[PDB]
Amino acid sequence: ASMGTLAFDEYGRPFLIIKDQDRKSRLMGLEALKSHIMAAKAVANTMRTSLGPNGLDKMMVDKDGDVTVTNDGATILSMMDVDHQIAKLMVELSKSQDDEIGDGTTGVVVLAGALLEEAEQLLDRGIHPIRIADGYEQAARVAIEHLDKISDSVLVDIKDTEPLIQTAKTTLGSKVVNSCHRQMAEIAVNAVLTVADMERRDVDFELIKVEGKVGGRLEDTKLIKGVIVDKDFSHPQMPKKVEDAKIAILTCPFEPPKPKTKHKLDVTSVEDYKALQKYEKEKFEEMIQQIKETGANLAICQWGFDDEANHLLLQNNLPAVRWVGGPEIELIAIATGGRIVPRFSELTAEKLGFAGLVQEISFGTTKDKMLVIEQCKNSRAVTIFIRGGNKMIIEEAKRSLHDALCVIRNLIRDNRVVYGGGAAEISCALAVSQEADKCPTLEQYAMRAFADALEVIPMALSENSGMNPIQTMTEVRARQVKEMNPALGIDCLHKGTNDMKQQHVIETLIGKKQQISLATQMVRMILKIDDIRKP
Amino acid sequence: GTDSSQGIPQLVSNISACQVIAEAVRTTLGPRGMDKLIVDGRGKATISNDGATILKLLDVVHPAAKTLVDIAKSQDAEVGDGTTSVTLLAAEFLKQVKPYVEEGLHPQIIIRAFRTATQLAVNKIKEIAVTVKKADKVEQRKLLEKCAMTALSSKLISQQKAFFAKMVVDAVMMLDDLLQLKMIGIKKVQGGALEDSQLVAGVAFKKTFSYAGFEMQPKKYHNPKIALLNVELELDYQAIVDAEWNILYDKLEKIHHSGAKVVLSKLPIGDVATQYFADRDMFCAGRVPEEDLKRTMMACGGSIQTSVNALSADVLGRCQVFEETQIGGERYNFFTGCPKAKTCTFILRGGAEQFMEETERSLHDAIMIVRRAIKNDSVVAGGGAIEMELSKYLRDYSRTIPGKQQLLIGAYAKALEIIPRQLCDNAGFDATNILNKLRARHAQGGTWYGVDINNEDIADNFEAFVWEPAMVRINALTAASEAACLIVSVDETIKNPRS
Amino acid sequence: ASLSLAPVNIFKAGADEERAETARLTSFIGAIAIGDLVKSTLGPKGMDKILLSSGRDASLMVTNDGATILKNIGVDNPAAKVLVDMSRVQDDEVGDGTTSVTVLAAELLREAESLIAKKIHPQTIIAGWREATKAAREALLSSAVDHGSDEVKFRQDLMNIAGTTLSSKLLTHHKDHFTKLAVEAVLRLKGSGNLEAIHIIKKLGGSLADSYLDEGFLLDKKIGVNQPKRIENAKILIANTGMDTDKIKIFGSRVRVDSTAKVAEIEHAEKEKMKEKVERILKHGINCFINRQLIYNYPEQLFGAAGVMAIEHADFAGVERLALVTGGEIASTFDHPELVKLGSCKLIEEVMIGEDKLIHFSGVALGEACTIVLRGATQQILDEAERSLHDALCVLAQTVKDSRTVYGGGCSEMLMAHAVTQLANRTPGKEAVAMESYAKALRMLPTIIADNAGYDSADLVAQLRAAHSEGNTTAGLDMREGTIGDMAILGITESFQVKRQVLLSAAEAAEVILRVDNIIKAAPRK
Numbered sequence A: 001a002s003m004g005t006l007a008f009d010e011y012g013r014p015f016l017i018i019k020d021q022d023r024k025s026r027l028m029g030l031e032a033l034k035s036h037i038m039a040a041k042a043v044a045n046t047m048r049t050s051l052g053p054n055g056l057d058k059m060m061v062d063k064d065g066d067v068t069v070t071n072d073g074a075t076i077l078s079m080m081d082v083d084h085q086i087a088k089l090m091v092e093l094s095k096s097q098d099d100e101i102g103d104g105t106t107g108v109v110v111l112a113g114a115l116l117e118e119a120e121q122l123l124d125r126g127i128h129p130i131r132i133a134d135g136y137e138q139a140a141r142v143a144i145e146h147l148d149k150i151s152d153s154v155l156v157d158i159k160d161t162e163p164l165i166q167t168a169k170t171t172l173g174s175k176v177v178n179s180c181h182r183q184m185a186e187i188a189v190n191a192v193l194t195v196a197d198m199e200r201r202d203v204d205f206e207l208i209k210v211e212g213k214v215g216g217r218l219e220d221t222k223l224i225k226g227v228i229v230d231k232d233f234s235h236p237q238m239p240k241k242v243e244d245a246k247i248a249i250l251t252c253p254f255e256p257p258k259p260k261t262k263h264k265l266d267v268t269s270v271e272d273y274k275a276l277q278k279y280e281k282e283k284f285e286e287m288i289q290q291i292k293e294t295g296a297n298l299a300i301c302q303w304g305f306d307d308e309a310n311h312l313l314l315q316n317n318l319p320a321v322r323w324v325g326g327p328e329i330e331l332i333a334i335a336t337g338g339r340i341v342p343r344f345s346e347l348t349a350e351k352l353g354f355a356g357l358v359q360e361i362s363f364g365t366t367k368d369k370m371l372v373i374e375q376c377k378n379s380r381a382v383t384i385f386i387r388g389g390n391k392m393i394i395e396e397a398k399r400s401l402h403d404a405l406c407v408i409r410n411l412i413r414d415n416r417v418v419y420g421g422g423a424a425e426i427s428c429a430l431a432v433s434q435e436a437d438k439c440p441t442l443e444q445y446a447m448r449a450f451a452d453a454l455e456v457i458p459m460a461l462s463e464n465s466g467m468n469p470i471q472t473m474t475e476v477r478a479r480q481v482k483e484m485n486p487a488l489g490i491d492c493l494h495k496g497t498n499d500m501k502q503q504h505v506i507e508t509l510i511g512k513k514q515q516i517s518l519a520t521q522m523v524r525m526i527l528k529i530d531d532i533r534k535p
Numbered sequence B: 001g002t003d004s005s006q007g008i009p010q011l012v013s014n015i016s017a018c019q020v021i022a023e024a025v026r027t028t029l030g031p032r033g034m035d036k037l038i039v040d041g042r043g044k045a046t047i048s049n050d051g052a053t054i055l056k057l058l059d060v061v062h063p064a065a066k067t068l069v070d071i072a073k074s075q076d077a078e079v080g081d082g083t084t085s086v087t088l089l090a091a092e093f094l095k096q097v098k099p100y101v102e103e104g105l106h107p108q109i110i111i112r113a114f115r116t117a118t119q120l121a122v123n124k125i126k127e128i129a130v131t132v133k134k135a136d137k138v139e140q141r142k143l144l145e146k147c148a149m150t151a152l153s154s155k156l157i158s159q160q161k162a163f164f165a166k167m168v169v170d171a172v173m174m175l176d177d178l179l180q181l182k183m184i185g186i187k188k189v190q191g192g193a194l195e196d197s198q199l200v201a202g203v204a205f206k207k208t209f210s211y212a213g214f215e216m217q218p219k220k221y222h223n224p225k226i227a228l229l230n231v232e233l234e235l236d237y238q239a240i241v242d243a244e245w246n247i248l249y250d251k252l253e254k255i256h257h258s259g260a261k262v263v264l265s266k267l268p269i270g271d272v273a274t275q276y277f278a279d280r281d282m283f284c285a286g287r288v289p290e291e292d293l294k295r296t297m298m299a300c301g302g303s304i305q306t307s308v309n310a311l312s313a314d315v316l317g318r319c320q321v322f323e324e325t326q327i328g329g330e331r332y333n334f335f336t337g338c339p340k341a342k343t344c345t346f347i348l349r350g351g352a353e354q355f356m357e358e359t360e361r362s363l364h365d366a367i368m369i370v371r372r373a374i375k376n377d378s379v380v381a382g383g384g385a386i387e388m389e390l391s392k393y394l395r396d397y398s399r400t401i402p403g404k405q406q407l408l409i410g411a412y413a414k415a416l417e418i419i420p421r422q423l424c425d426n427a428g429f430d431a432t433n434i435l436n437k438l439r440a441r442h443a444q445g446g447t448w449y450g451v452d453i454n455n456e457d458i459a460d461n462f463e464a465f466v467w468e469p470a471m472v473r474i475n476a477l478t479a480a481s482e483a484a485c486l487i488v489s490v491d492e493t494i495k496n497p498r499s
Numbered sequence C: 001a002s003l004s005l006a007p008v009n010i011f012k013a014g015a016d017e018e019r020a021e022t023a024r025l026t027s028f029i030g031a032i033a034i035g036d037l038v039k040s041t042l043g044p045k046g047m048d049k050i051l052l053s054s055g056r057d058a059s060l061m062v063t064n065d066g067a068t069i070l071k072n073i074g075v076d077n078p079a080a081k082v083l084v085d086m087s088r089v090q091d092d093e094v095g096d097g098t099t100s101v102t103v104l105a106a107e108l109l110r111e112a113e114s115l116i117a118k119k120i121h122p123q124t125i126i127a128g129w130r131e132a133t134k135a136a137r138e139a140l141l142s143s144a145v146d147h148g149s150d151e152v153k154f155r156q157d158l159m160n161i162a163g164t165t166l167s168s169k170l171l172t173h174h175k176d177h178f179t180k181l182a183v184e185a186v187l188r189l190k191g192s193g194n195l196e197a198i199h200i201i202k203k204l205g206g207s208l209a210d211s212y213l214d215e216g217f218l219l220d221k222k223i224g225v226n227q228p229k230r231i232e233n234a235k236i237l238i239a240n241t242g243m244d245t246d247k248i249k250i251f252g253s254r255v256r257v258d259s260t261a262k263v264a265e266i267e268h269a270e271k272e273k274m275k276e277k278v279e280r281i282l283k284h285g286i287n288c289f290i291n292r293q294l295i296y297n298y299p300e301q302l303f304g305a306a307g308v309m310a311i312e313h314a315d316f317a318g319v320e321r322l323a324l325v326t327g328g329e330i331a332s333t334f335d336h337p338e339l340v341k342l343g344s345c346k347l348i349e350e351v352m353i354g355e356d357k358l359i360h361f362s363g364v365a366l367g368e369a370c371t372i373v374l375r376g377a378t379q380q381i382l383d384e385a386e387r388s389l390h391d392a393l394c395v396l397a398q399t400v401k402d403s404r405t406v407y408g409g410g411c412s413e414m415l416m417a418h419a420v421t422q423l424a425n426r427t428p429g430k431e432a433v434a435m436e437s438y439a440k441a442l443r444m445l446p447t448i449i450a451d452n453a454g455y456d457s458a459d460l461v462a463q464l465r466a467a468h469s470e471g472n473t474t475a476g477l478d479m480r481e482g483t484i485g486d487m488a489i490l491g492i493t494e495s496f497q498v499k500r501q502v503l504l505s506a507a508e509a510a511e512v513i514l515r516v517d518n519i520i521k522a523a524p525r526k
């Protein structure tokens, strides 16, 4: 056990082979697989409690000390201190699931953990992982055909909101935001339907940025159709309200250009200094006249400008802002149709933007103000500006909106949906049990193993609140054998019936299909690892 | 703080390092062999069931380990994939000669005995090798199709596997020019049934945001050829901006005058200017992959342009036809229709996103298995059958040699037994009983019984159509013996640092 | 399958994450610590608190308001950080009630861990707390009153509200004078929320009763040497011009001469350009000049020869507020005398208070600013005075924006107590128990309110309960006698919006905290 083999020689003379094996570790096969699946316990049983409507939130802190409370499983596991390689592999499993689905992050992790745990007490009986992998693939195809048995479709029209509202509400019920449930359902619907493409294509996330700052109330949440910038006007004395603002995009400082080549200029007489002064003054006046040429009602800079230019702009009654970042300028231009003006000579009449309404909002005694444009006729950007108790409730609202947008996107890119809430997984358990009954014993072991592992979803759903697991199972499959419906599951909030159709518990079929598939394949390929050689 | 560099201690250290190297890659041998994710330290984990790739990504500092790895790489580049087999065989030689060098057997006696045993085995293998090339291989290809079966046996893809084997075998007859790894490639397609995979005499490359210019190309064009341009085409004020406009205008005029159906530019071609750049009146693209190029100069000879208004005869040269159709809802970009399209690509049509690894392990083996079957004539039963036969020959001949070579040849014969052992290990079965049955049957009953991966029992692998080139096995065994001889021939290590 | 007893674990050097129940323990003990550090400053008998940084710097704060107390404190519990965040949000919204909402949240978490010990699940707690918050909001809406339409009634309500707000501060002795001053300043702002338009001086010496809201201003700058020491009815000019070590922004030019005559001619050129710049300054018709940057000897000598006052080192905020209140303008190009705006002033002089010289300003044109002289004995009593004045101004401005008011001082508190009590009595289940613990914490807030003076708790709770039973939504405690009274008559009035925001924020923060189960810690950096 400890220190490997304790001989130090074959006859008795001084000898050594392994460098400091006393403080090293050697693993060969089963012990390595136990280490991996014990990591699987760590990740899965940490993740499990955020499942279902009674899913609580988590506090996770890195070595930096970032305060983070979330409810979307991928978000919990995103920045947690991952140490073991297979745990990290599960982390990008969840990341990929979120990227190509956006919902069901909790399901994949818990399912994989259950599969791997049941596989380890399978191995404890002395069975080689290839058989378990084959049995799990058979379970995967059985589950896939069972899902295909009771599939259903929805509408993919832009105007359709009521089933969309129901699905978003079901998705967001498990979060803290369920106080304003229907309100934010409508808000998410408006945000997604403001800009949308029906040509089976995606919506760029670089075009849409959603942010919010502290203060206000949760009910104050609304949809802002415009560009928001956390910047104020260059001169405070200038009146903050500007209408018909012709956005003049500028991305150059109001300073003379200078080449990077190593050059030296020598000044020897009064005439040279006076000529340089006159040239600087005339060029500044030229810049001011060029700005005044178009008569724009809004000029946006990049790197700011000095006090002389500030007074020149103020004296001309020309609205302007300074210290605006490059990405912000690009977003403003693409939303307002403006062009790029990297220098003074490129300031033309065809390279300016326009905003329908520019407004500044102050919440009172905060000493910091904000400027947001909105009502853009051809806006290329949308956003939600939420108000709440403090920063982390706002961040949770951001993540809830992200999940709602994800589920709406899933409903749009494919109409196929099913009902869950413990119904689909229990039906899958019944199916896998049936094929196990009609399975040869050697792989019937793995069949029933996979069934037992996949029955972990109602386990976590019940233990997040408290109802019994097993009588719940009994009542559910009794009703399912009495009549088949993809919505015979768990009554989490005591609605009276186990019928998700009445309670409008809706989730996309594609999400849970990929849940099962990804869980199966990654569980298999983890079963294809049995070696660790930590030095 | 232990120092050991004397002759015998250095020999045992070197061969123990070789033992560790073998122990690292013990379990990856065979078709059902398992693997390990190895991270390069940059966050990029690597999975590759091929042992040769594992050693390529592996890095070890021991000089003996370095020599063994170099010999493995040399074997890899010559024929087939026997790196795991030869490394395991050499390491077995070393670990079974441990108890012989540990008490005073001089290395030269061992070298001589190993050479003698290698000659004995390479001569006794030729009396058992059976040639099958004349047994209806070039025509009436049922036997070669069964050889293709053996690479993908015992799987539910069998219905698709038969069609895929006929696919690859017909590709072999119409590309029977000693096919290699790079002459044939595969491309991934998402969605569709597994049966929908079909062979195209060309390549497939989906167009992306920085790949192609615009849609509705003239697919049915009589002579479309690839044209490669090393000049930008995508989109003080009156000094460089007007220069940019003039450059754009003259490049557009060059594109119009050239008339090349397919045009490639070195800078990426953005799709945001699809309406801006739809006026070219012929297909234009950019950011061509190097693999796509390498699959097109030998196809029908795509040209390269290297001037402001460079025009060549092969911008619109003679290639049969261009293919550009919607594959899975997104239009691809096929550089097909070539007189010398010596590159057949298997369209990976399947509904599984993570099926690429299974396709690589399941489609690359069929072409290799049929190519090795065609290239050589004499074959012997695989699955450790030939190894067991050689072990029996060497064990029964060692007792006939009077001299110190007896124990050395006996250890050599004992070390030729790991191939069935490793195969049944990777299969997961208990090695003792299967090896016992295989050895007893091979020594007494038959001369070709080998391991079975499907039913996990001893069977005559000759009847199971488990073939392997006799010459490939001969040279692999010779290389393993040479590696063992070289690593035994070590006495002292000299480093003499410059610092 | 947990880490309570496991042969193997996954941790980094020094890393040891901790389970859900002990996570609740640690987070809630941190919340209790935050509440204890912010409590004891409630009610008219609030007690000041000192700050002393653990390092050698030892940052020392003296203030009666808990928001500043929690601003400067080391944080280790993330729930404590949540509490600090919500308190800061309340402070950014309104001035008063931040300590109220903080202590409400702290006691709510106390009762939450008590309920956890009472073997109940957090989700039922959150549901019950949401229902109870709804009921309490309804009850508060029942007795809401607004009197912003009538100007005289609005002024009376402002008087009462500012008096109640300043009672909890140290200025309770001169509460009446301070309230009159606050009303005058707020009505001089014409209802504007521009806090930067209000400045209060921190000068040492004198008695706090001598404080007054002077209509003019005070300048802390110094008079030049040759410049006149008294200029009356001048014109206010504000400039951004550097006019110190003046050089062209082009750094690519250097002096490479072969004779010192060239250097002397160059220096003559800069002195001539200085003379031209001074002439450009003087041609605008100015007598008082305000500058952000320093002034050299030649410009001040020329100004003294020209008889024009010069003011230097006046920051952007001060000059901007001066332009807002007077009529001046900030400038950088002096070739446009007609395009530069100047203010109108009446009285500029010097005043000697104690042993320090101050340039006194008076006779404003617009009057859209508030400056108050404070005769604080020490620096810290001063800081308390400005903090209390700022809180009073903020609450007056908020009442101006929203004139709905209620009667607090424990009266409204017992109103919510009664509402949640009936709600609990009219429903079964652990939800009712959870919201009864809610209401018990609500009632425990006046426990601290009254025990800052050492008064009876249970007797007054029962008395107010009976009074609200007869329907007296105006019966609250009086610190003078410890009995009931009419808060309308007694003048203890509170803004409806501020109180509703406090209640809602406390409920929301409690709900947020109760939804976290497990806290995991990475490897500590120390």
Ligand SMILES: Nc1ncnc2c1ncn2[C@@H]1O[C@H](COP(=O)(O)OP(=O)(O)O)[C@@H](O)[C@H]1O
Binding pocket: A050, A051, A052, A053, A055, A072, A073, A102, A103, A104, A105, A106, A107, A170, A171, A173, A174, A175, A420, A421, A422, A490, A492, A505, A507
């Ligand atoms: N109201 C509800 N009733 C029953 N089950 C629910 C309800 N809301 C959510 N669920 C279940 O919770 C599971 C996971 O939801 P959640 O963890 O909140 O987000 P995600 O789906 O991204 O993991 C879903 O599979 C769904 O079946």
Ligand SMILES: Nc1ncnc2c1ncn2[C@@H]1O[C@H](COP(=O)(O)OP(=O)(O)O)[C@@H](O)[C@H]1O
Binding pocket: B028, B029, B030, B031, B049, B050, B051, B052, B081, B082, B083, B084, B085, B150, B151, B153, B382, B383, B384, B419, B423, B451, B452, B453, B454
């Ligand atoms: N279907 C099969 N059943 C049994 N053995 C097989 C089968 N297919 C291949 N093998 C064995 O695999 C060996 C070849 O493996 P090899 O290519 O050396 O692995 P690697 O590429 O990792 O070096 C052969 O000796 C053969 O006996």
Ligand SMILES: Nc1ncnc2c1ncn2[C@@H]1O[C@H](COP(=O)(O)OP(=O)(O)O)[C@@H](O)[C@H]1O
Binding pocket: C041, C042, C043, C044, C046, C064, C065, C066, C095, C096, C097, C098, C099, C100, C163, C164, C165, C166, C167, C168, C169, C408, C409, C410, C477, C478, C479, C492, C494
């Ligand atoms: N005369 C009074 N009688 C009863 N309660 C009062 C009286 N004056 C103030 N209070 C209460 O004491 C609390 C403390 O106020 P203060 O310390 O000024 O700000 P904060 O409310 O942020 O602590 C206030 O919420 C107020 O309701």
